[PDB]
Design a protein around this ligand. Structure first.
Ligand SMILES: CCCCCCCCCCCCCCCCCC(=O)OC[C@H](COP(=O)([O-])OCC(O)COP(=O)([O-])OC[C@@H](COC(=O)CCCCCCCCCCCCCCCCC)OC(=O)CCCCCCCCCCCCCCCCC)OC(=O)CCCCCCCCCCCCCCCCC
Ligand SMILES: CCCCCCCCCCCCCCCCCC(=O)OC[C@H](COP(=O)([O-])OCC(O)COP(=O)([O-])OC[C@@H](COC(=O)CCCCCCCCCCCCCCCCC)OC(=O)CCCCCCCCCCCCCCCCC)OC(=O)CCCCCCCCCCCCCCCCC
Ligand SMILES: CCCCCCCCCCCCCCCCC[C@@H](O)O[C@H](CO[C@H](O)CCCCCCCCCCCCCCC)COP(=O)(O)OCC[N+](C)(C)C
Ligand SMILES: CCCCCCCC/C=C\CCCCCCCC(=O)OC[C@H](COP(=O)(O)OCCN)OC(=O)CCCCCCC/C=C\CCCCCCCC
Ligand SMILES: CCCCCCCC/C=C\CCCCCCCC(=O)OC[C@H](COP(=O)(O)OCCN)OC(=O)CCCCCCC/C=C\CCCCCCCC
Lengths: 140, 52, 19, 347, 121, 47, 281, 97, 36, 63, 459
């Protein structure tokens, strides 16, 4: 629900890293359940225990990514104490890929995931700073 | 493309079935005819947007 | 230098039900 | 099935859509789609194949469930406002479902999976008609309910239709499935701008229909299907392959060509709304859409796949049963670019 | 939708009597002649597709095409100018309708205003 | 007999006409812009 | 589509394709058949059979009209060039067209018409060539896929007479026959022909001929016209080395085909051959 | 895939005939080709075009700038002040916060 | 073939001309009236 | 030619294109407002007319 | 001007209606004539940019380029018209249409004026050159090459497109003159930075940048020479023209964003030139030389000092002519022996002299020695660069080292030395060959006499 992202949105700044990290963990878990849902839907696992194995995989992975992203971001905020510039998320962004790199046990995918996930996060922060509309209202 | 040919030709072939009031057989009242009537009389040149 | 126009082994790759 | 009946079916399809474009009352719209369906299935069943049958099974099954959800959401709208006129809907839980039902009717992703399959199951005549005429009515109602659309929900399917309309297009050989992913991709561009400004939608619609008329008339003219089957045509009647190249590029929207006119008005409109990021992603992916038009161009005109010998006798025999409407459908779908401003005729 | 649903006016008529007053496009408006060549080339492809000895053959039908598209192109141009003239009219009427929201801002000159200078280095 | 030789040089007439038509169009598009001829600077009274 | 004005013909008849199976006896079969039927006799419809109907009505060079040449089959069968097959399939396409040339006429004038050998009979030559090994097996697989894809839609067959001649006796007439290539032809091949021919062809087809809707006929009538359609699947891309041609030779040969007086343009328009210019006005 | 043998070679025009000036196979046309190509490639554009551009009127307004510059040098020198203003605009003509 | 269709379609084409110049011609006059 | 023609032409050009510019911006203002309010003639959406409503006594005294 | 542009369209009917064996003469002669007509445009003005219709104008920056672009068509014809012969008449007649249609798009896209018109033509150029690379290139790789040539343009161009639309909404008109006057600074933030890259990346793709140039060699390896001459001599240069155009906006932000691209360029020049020092085959060697020179243009644009734009213009044109010259001059060998690989040519000088002379002149101006417009074009931008940073010279100098070496190298390896023995194929130089390259090199040398008409607007 939007109320959940709204929950994560009230960081504030980066204070209480745990409070934030729990929320990011929540979002990562949500997306993990969705991806698991379509995956099961479109790739009939055969033998249902394997299916819950699959969903356990994705759910735990995405939840992990969200957790580590959130807490590295807030910690960087509470350490560099810059704390508002976009790069402050980027480390976590770069960190996130490595998490993804760990479960996949591959340097390659982890390496790429570092860079792109990093840039995406950086753009997100930059967007919060700039009020980018992504889905702008018809206005015109 | 809401062509409104039925209006330009005046056929009205569809329009009658619309709305709670709008002449019904044996003039049977709608259960909520009044609030509806007022509310539609409120609605004309205001058109859609300011109307809400 | 007689141009180059595609060979059989070339064309076969499209010949599958799905590239 | 003798022409006298076939024509009555196809005319009652035309009627079954015209009815949607006329009536203001909702019930007549749901009747419009409903009559449209019954008259759409049999025409897919001409010639009749063991394959075609399950094609029609797919199409019917999805259209039926779509029409069902639609009628349900109408009834819920009535429950919470007691109206039948189109206008604004008055209950978001209903409105999202009317959006879903229409989302199936256009074949937008992730509801899209039926369209590439169904196209495979029928001849290019019934195919073309399915990819053009069937795209009118649901859009014909979306233009009428643009006023209250929940833009988030619309842009998400509008984008995802473009990504899926891309990635699923790089993969296939036989052309009909590719035409399916082309259309499934353009619908993303139509339904994208719809919340913001319907006139751009209708413009893009006209270009799309003209385009796919160009292609399907050409595929008919050469009776090509699988890509390789298309490859031979360069030697027999070189012109038409030498023209598929161009119409393909107009699908691709290389800017002198007409097919660029849609995108380049769309980018305008959305940009007035700010929303600057979305068109950038969209326009970038449209490239990915272009690429398989290009590869398909490589199989055909630009390069000569080896001919089969048996072709030679066929050289003596001119094609027949000329399709009158074709040349104009090429030309309008290409050269018309310095006639954008005329779009305002659509007000 | 704008323009559509505007008060007054009637649906399917292609072109209001409220137009007419606008000057007609002149006979050799370049856009229009471009409709000409558009029809021309279509008429030519009509030959080339059906083999034919291109150009010289069927000069008849070719003339039919060019007359066709120039003809429709004419009225389409009339509706074009009508529509744009229309939005210009509605716009100005609306700017008189709400003078407050379209302020007549005072125009300070360059001498009057400061602006930061950025040296090129 | 020679008329066919004229057919050989039929095409050559085409482009210079394009240049003529070009100077013509220059003069017309230039004609449309005669908004001033009363500039703040370069305008002596006509004779 | 004009059928709506008349709801198709109610007339019916039959075309007759005698199935004489020999060398010199093949000719003998044709002579008996020509006298036998009022409808014009099949002339064999070989390499230039298409050329006969093309417009000039006249045979071209072998190089492009067929690029097979039967004499170059008999003189060197099992040529490394797959001519041993290239002829087979090419003839099949021509004979298919034969059907179309005449069966349409059956649906038109309603008169009977006499074919010479017809498509069902083309099963057997390949049936033996595969046995003598003149053609490789994939050539065959191509031949029966194209067979299944094309023949199946042609529905009615027959109204036609099977025949027989002794292999040795045909060998005797073959000796009498003037052409050198015919004389060279091997016996064991021909015996394998007659054996499989009698074993299967009549064995299946007679069951259908023994039985010898209007709307379907009209649909079939549409198929008879616009012959490329009947040819539409004969140029299926399967890319066997003997049939297939590289782009250079094809681009060149077709570049040569246009060189002919009657082929640049559709027949009614062509200026090279004295078609009226008045239409070009 | 049966195919035509191969391109015999690039073919020398010279193989056909000494003197050909490159260009077309037809001996007749070639002479005309080099002639037209030279007469215009050199004798009209590289000369008349070059002389043309060489004598283009000074719309650079350079000489004008020199002459007029002299015209200011005179007054600046005779009046004696100050040649170069430090200010490209009058100070009193502009307001400042 | 001198034929009928040729003069048929040609005649229709000339008709679309003369009709067009017609309606244009009057349209200009109506312009002059409504305006100047 | 003398610069004069160039100069007058440049003048007229800058005038015209400037006018279009300002008109486009003004148009965007007019549009944002007109959609924001609906007060303007050309964004208002269709809405139901009175003409359908009847005005007759109806069985039950009230409505 | 609208006068030069019509006949350029008019050759097409002339081409199609030309007698089947005479077409080359038609297209050649009239293309030359229209070149001379193009030349009258050059006059410009010393103050105001020249103007025409509402929809065109002719800045001094465009005029020499326009003259060049008109000038190249005959050249490509002279190169092509023996490369192809066995092709069918309709196909050939179809072929020159690609070329002329192309230059038509150029004459339109140089005079601009609206930057959206300028864009749509800027990207419209992409089609004919694609068709030419793909249908008439030799060997297989060309197919793949087509794609690299294509998406790298579009992936660059598309964001630029959206950006353009944006501005005409945030300000009034998109037109160039007023935007030159109404220009107002954009500054830092983050939205404005993405505006910056959006309005630069396409132009910096079309003239290759060192991190992105990969398509360019692989285009030149493939394209038939008529495609090569344009793809090298012009399109790069037009990307530069546009980037010089849009810099009317931006500022002061350019001061802050130039650095990364100045690093990719200042390093990429020495780098690509270094790769240039060890190619297997000539046709690529030339291409990398081309990138190695374009890096100079792109820093010359980004330091934005007026000297740097002067040098920008000069170097753009000079490199145009010299690069096209090297390409035709290489194709000649490739036709005489089909080697492509440089090693097989060997002692080509021994067997024929005058081509060695053209090798000499061409390479000689490639290295750029005085007073070639190439050189003088280059020295300015070194001057302004040096003003921008005193260190920068140490980089520029290395360039001027390696561009010597490989240039002379291509000379001494494919010429001086022993003839290969068995290669009997060579056949003593056609008139059109000499005619062609004399046509490249003479204008290039006359042009030095009168730089003042080539330096461009900031003269
Ligand atoms: C008799 C049969 C022959 C009739 C034709 C005679 C000549 C007509 C002519 O060409 O000039 C029109 C001519 C004068 O034109 P104009 O109104 O003064 O404006 C011309 C300027 O260029 C100003 O024109 P403009 O304001 O309309 O500007 C054109 C503008 C808007 O107009 C257009 O869009 C048309 C341009 C598209 C191409 C034109 C096709 C070729 C024609 O388009 C653009 O600015 C951008 C073009 C879009 C480019 C798209 C990408 C391209 C790559 O009108 C006449 O009345 C001449 C008739 C005289 C008697 C004819 C009998 C002689 C025999
Ligand atoms: C924009 C383009 C729109 C679509 C046009 C595509 C052109 C297709 C084409 O030319 O294929 C021929 C050609 C077919 O080979 P072919 O064996 O020589 O075919 C015989 C000719 O089609 C027939 O040869 P022909 O000699 O019998 O035809 C003579 C005709 C040429 O007729 C044509 O072949 C094409 C007709 C041109 C249509 C013009 C479209 C609008 C401009 O020459 C003309 O007169 C053209 C009209 C110029 C008069 C205008 C006067 C105004 C003043 O295509 C190719 O093999 C290579 C093309 C590969 C792909 C590139 C396609 C575009 C570049
Ligand atoms: C079997 C194969 C499948 C075939 C499927 C294809 C079918 C195509 C149908 C296309 C629909 C076009 C509509 C034309 C109907 C004519 C009725 C016309 O008079 O309508 C009037 C309005 O006039 C129309 O706008 C005229 C449209 C004319 C079509 C072309 C316009 C210009 C084209 C722009 C693209 C550039 C190409 C031009 C080159 C010639 C009244 O409508 P109005 O009550 O007012 O508003 C309706 C609501 N709208 C605007 C949202 C639709
Ligand atoms: C998120 C959505 C946004 C999309 C991101 C960018 C989309 C643009 C890319 C669209 C096409 C990319 C690949 C499509 C075709 C393809 O995959 O080709 C792979 C194919 C592999 O061989 P096969 O086809 O499998 O068979 C071999 C038989 N001999 O080889 C190729 O063709 C690859 C080379 C062509 C594509 C390269 C395009 C260049 C780079 C693309 C984008 C670059 C951005 C531009 C840089 C500027 C930055 C603003
Ligand atoms: C997998 C492979 C394919 C993936 C490729 C990855 C490509 C990543 C590109 C990143 C795209 C970023 C999108 C965001 C753009 C953006 O933020 O624009 C907003 C901004 C302002 O919006 P406003 O609403 O008006 O806000 C201002 C007032 N509040 O919009 C604008 O003004 C200009 C719009 C232009 C956007 C285009 C940007 C994309 C350019 C690509 C750059 C590529 C970098 C190349 C680096 C090479 C250098 C060595």
């Amino acid at each position: 629900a939007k109320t959940l992202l709204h929950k994560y949105s009230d960081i504030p700044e980066g204070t209480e890293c745990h409070r934030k990290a729990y929320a990011s963990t929540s979002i990562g878990g949500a997306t993990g359940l969705i991806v698991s849902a379509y995956s099961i839907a479109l790739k009939p696992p055969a033998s249902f225990l394997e299916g819950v194995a699959r969903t356990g995989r994705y759910t735990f992975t995405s939840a992990a990514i969200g957790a580590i992203f959130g807490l590295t971001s807030c910690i960087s905020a509470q350490v560099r104490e810059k704390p508002d510039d976009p790069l402050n998320y980027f480390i976590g962004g770069c960190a996130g890929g490595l998490t993804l790199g760990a479960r996949t046990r591959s340097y390659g995918i982890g390496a790429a995931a570092c860079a792109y996930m990093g840039l995406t996060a950086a753009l997100v922060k930059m967007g919060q700073l700039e009020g980018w509309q992504v889905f702008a209202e018809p206005k015109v | 493309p809401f062509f409104d040919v039925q209006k330009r030709l005046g056929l009205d072939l569809d329009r009658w079935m619309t709305i709670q009031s709008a002449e019904q057989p044996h003039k049977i009242p709608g259960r909520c005819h009044a609030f509806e009537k007022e509310w539609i009389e409120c609605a004309h040149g205001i058109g859609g947007i300011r109307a809400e | 230098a007689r141009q180059w126009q595609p060979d059989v082994e070339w064309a076969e790759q499209f010949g599958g039900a799905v590239m | 099935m003798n022409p006298i009946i076939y024509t009555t079916l196809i005319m009652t399809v035309m009627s079954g859509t015209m009815l949607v474009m006329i009536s203001s009352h909702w019930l007549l719209i749901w009747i419009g789609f409903e009559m449209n369906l019954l008259a759409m299935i049999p025409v897919l069943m001409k010639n009749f194949n063991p394959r075609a049958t399950e094609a029609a099974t797919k199409y019917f099954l999805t259209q039926a469930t779509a029409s069902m959800m639609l009628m349900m959401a109408i009834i819920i709208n009535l429950l919470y406002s007691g109206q039948w006129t189109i206008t604004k809907m008055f209950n978001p839980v209903a409105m999202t479902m009317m959006t879903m039902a229409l989302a199936m009717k256009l074949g937008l992703s992730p509801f899209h999976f039926w369209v590439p399959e169904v196209t495979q199951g029928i001849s290019l005549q019934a195919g073309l008609l399915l990819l053009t005429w069937q795209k009118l009515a649901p859009l014909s109602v979306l233009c009428q309910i643009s006023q209250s659309i929940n833009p988030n929900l619309m842009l998400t399917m509008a984008m995802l239709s473009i990504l899926i309309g891309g990635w699923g297009g790089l993969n296939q050989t036989q052309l009909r499935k590719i035409m399916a992913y082309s259309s499934i991709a353009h619908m993303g561009w139509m339904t994208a701008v719809l919340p913001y400004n319907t006139t751009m939608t209708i413009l893009n619609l006209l270009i799309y229909i003209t385009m796919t008329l160009a292609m399907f008339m050409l595929l008919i003219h050469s009776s090509a299907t699988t890509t390789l089957s298309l490859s031979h045509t360069w030697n027999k009647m070189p012109v038409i392959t030498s023209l598929m190249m161009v119409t393909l590029l107009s699908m691709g929207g290389l800017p002198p060509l007409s097919g660029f006119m849609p995108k380049w008005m769309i980018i305008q409109e959305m940009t007035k709304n700010e929303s600057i990021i979305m068109p950038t992603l969209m326009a970038m992916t449209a490239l990915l859409n272009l690429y398989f038009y290009m590869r398909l161009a490589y199989s055909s005109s630009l390069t000569m796949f080896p001919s089969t010998n048996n072709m030679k006798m066929k050289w003596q025999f001119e094609h027949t049963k000329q399709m009158k409407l074709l040349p104009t459908m090429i030309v309008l779908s290409t050269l018309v670019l310095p006639m954008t401003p005329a779009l305002s005729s659509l007000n | 939708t704008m323009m559509s649903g505007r008060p007054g006016r009637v649906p399917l008529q292609f072109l209001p009597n409220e137009a007419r007053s606008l000057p007609p496009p002149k006979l050799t408006d370049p856009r229009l002649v471009y409709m000409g060549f558009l029809g021309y080339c279509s008429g030519l492809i009509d030959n080339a597709i059906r083999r034919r000895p291109v150009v010289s053959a069927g000069l008849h039908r070719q003339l039919l095409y060019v007359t066709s598209f120039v003809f429709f192109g004419y009225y389409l141009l009339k509706r074009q100018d009508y529509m744009y003239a229309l939005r210009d009219h509605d716009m100005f009427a609306y700017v008189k309708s709400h003078p407050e929201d379209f302020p007549e801002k005072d125009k300070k000159t360059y001498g009057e205003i400061l602006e930061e200078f950025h040296p090129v280095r | 007999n020679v008329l066919q030789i004229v057919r050989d040089h039929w095409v050559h007439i085409l482009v210079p006409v394009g240049f003529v038509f070009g100077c013509y169009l220059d003069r017309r598009s230039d004609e449309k812009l005669t908004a001033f001829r009363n500039k703040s600077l370069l305008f002596k009274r006509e004779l | 589509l004009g059928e709506r004005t008349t709801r198709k013909l109610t007339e019916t008849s039959k075309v007759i394709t005698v199935d004489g199976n020999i060398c010199s006896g093949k000719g003998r079969l044709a002579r008996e058949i020509a006298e036998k039927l009022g409808l014009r006799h099949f002339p064999e419809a070989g390499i230039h059979y298409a050329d006969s109907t093309t417009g000039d009505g006249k045979p071209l060079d072998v190089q492009l009209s067929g690029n097979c040449s039967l004499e170059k089959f008999y003189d060197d069968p099992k040529s490394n060039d797959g001519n041993s097959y290239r002829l087979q399939s090419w003839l099949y396409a021509s004979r298919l067209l034969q059907y179309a040339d005449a069966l349409e006429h059956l649906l038109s004038t309603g008169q009977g018409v006499v074919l010479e050998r017809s498509i069902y009979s083309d099963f057997v030559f390949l049936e033996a060539m595969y046995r003598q090994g003149f053609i490789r097996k994939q050539c065959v697989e191509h031949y029966n896929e194209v067979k299944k894809v094309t023949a199946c839609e042609y529905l009615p067959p027959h109204v036609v007479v099977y025949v027989d001649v002794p292999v040795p006796e045909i060998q005797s007439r073959i000796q009498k026959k003037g052409n050198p290539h015919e004389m060279k032809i091997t016996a064991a091949y021909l015996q394998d022909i007659e054996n499989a021919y009698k074993k299967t062809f009549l064995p299946e087809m007679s069951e259908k001929c023994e039985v010898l809707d209007d709307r379907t006929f009209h649909r079939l009538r549409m198929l008879v016209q616009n012959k490329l359609e009947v040819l539409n699947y004969t140029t299926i891309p399967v890319y066997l080395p003997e049939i297939t041609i590289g782009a250079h030779q094809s681009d060149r040969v077709f570049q040569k085909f246009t060189e002919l007086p009657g082929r640049k343009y559709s027949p009614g328009y062509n200026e090279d051959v004295g078609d009226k210019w008045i239409w070009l006005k | 895939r049966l195919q035509e043998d191969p391109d015999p070679e690039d073919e020398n025009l010279y193989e056909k005939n000494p003197d050909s000036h490159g260009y077309d196979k037809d001996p007749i046309v070639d002479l005309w080709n080099m002639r037209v190509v030279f007469f215009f490639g050199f004798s009209i554009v590289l000369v008349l075009g070059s002389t043309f551009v060489a004598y283009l009127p000074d719309y650079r307004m350079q000489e004008w700038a020199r002459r007029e510059a002299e015209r200011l040098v005179k007054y600046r020198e005779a009046n004696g002040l100050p040649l170069m203003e430090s200010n490209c605009f009058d100070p009193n003509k502009i307001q400042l916060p | 073939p001198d034929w009928l269709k040729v003069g048929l379609t040609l005649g229709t084409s000339v008709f679309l001309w003369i009709y067009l110049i017609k309606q244009h011609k009057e349209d200009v006059l109506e312009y002059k009236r409504r305006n100047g | 030619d003398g610069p004069e023609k160039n100069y007058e032409k440049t003048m007229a050009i800058l005038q015209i294109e400037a006018e279009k510019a300002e008109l486009r911006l003004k148009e965007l203002e007019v549009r944002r407002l007109m959609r924001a309010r609906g007060d303007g003639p050309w964004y208002q959406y269709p809405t139901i007319d009175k003409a359908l409503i009847d005005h007759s006594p109806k069985t039950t005294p009230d409505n | 001007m609208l006068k030069i542009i019509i006949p350029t369209t008019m050759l097409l009917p002339m081409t199609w209606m030309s007698k089947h064996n005479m077409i080359w003469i038609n297209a050649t002669v009239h293309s030359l004539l229209i070149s001379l007509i193009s030349l009258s445009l050059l006059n410009q003005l010393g103050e105001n940019s020249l103007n025409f219709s509402l929809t065109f104008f002719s800045d001094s920056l465009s005029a020499p380029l326009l003259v060049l672009t008109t000038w190249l068509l005959p050249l490509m014809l002279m190169a092509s018209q023996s490369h192809l012969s066995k092709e069918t008449t309709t196909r050939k007649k179809l072929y020159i249409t690609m070329l002329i249609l192309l230059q038509l798009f150029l004459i339109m896209t140089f005079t601009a004026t609206e930057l959206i018109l300028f864009y749509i033509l800027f990207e419209a150029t992409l089609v004919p050159t694609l068709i030419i690379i793909t249908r008439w290139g030799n060997q297989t790789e060309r197919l793949n090459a087509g794609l690299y040539f294509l998406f790298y343009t579009l992936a660059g161009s598309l964001p630029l497109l959206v950006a353009l639309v944006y501005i005409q909404n945030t300000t009034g008109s998109l037109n160039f003159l007023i935007i030159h006057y109404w220009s107002h600074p954009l500054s830092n933030s983050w939205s404005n930075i993405f505006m910056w890259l959006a309005c630069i990346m396409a132009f910096m793709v079309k003239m290759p940048l060192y991190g992105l140039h990969l398509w360019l060699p692989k285009a030149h390896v493939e394209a038939p020479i008529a495609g090569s001459m344009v793809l090298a001599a012009v399109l790069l240069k037009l990307g530069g023209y546009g980037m010089m155009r849009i810099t009317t906006i931006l500022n002061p932000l350019t001061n802050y964003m130039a650095y990364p691209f100045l690093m990719l360029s200042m390093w990429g020049m020495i780098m690509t030139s270094s790769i240039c020092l060890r190619q297997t085959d000539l046709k690529s060697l030339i291409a990398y030389s081309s990138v190695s020179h374009m890096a100079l243009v792109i820093v010359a644009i980004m330091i934005q000092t007026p000297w740097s734009f002067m040098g920008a213009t000069a170097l753009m044109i000079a490199h145009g002519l010299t690069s096209s010259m090297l390409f035709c001059l290489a194709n000649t060998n490739y036709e005489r022996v089909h080697s492509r690989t440089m090693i097989l040519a060997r002692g080509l000088q021994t067997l024929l002299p005058l081509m060695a002379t053209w090798w000499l002149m061409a390479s000689l101006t490639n290295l750029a020695l005085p007073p070639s417009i190439n050189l003088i074009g280059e020295l300015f931008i070194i001057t302004a660069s040096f003003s921008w940073s005193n260190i920068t010279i140490i980089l520029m100098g290395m360039n001027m080292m390696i561009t010597a070496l490989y240039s002379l190298y291509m000379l001494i390896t494919t010429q001086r030395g022993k003839y290969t023995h068995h290669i009997n194929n060579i056949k003593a130089s056609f008139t059109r060959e000499n005619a062609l390259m004399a046509l490249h090199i003479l204008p290039l040398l006359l042009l030095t006499l009168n730089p003042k008409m080539i330096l461009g607007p900031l003269y």
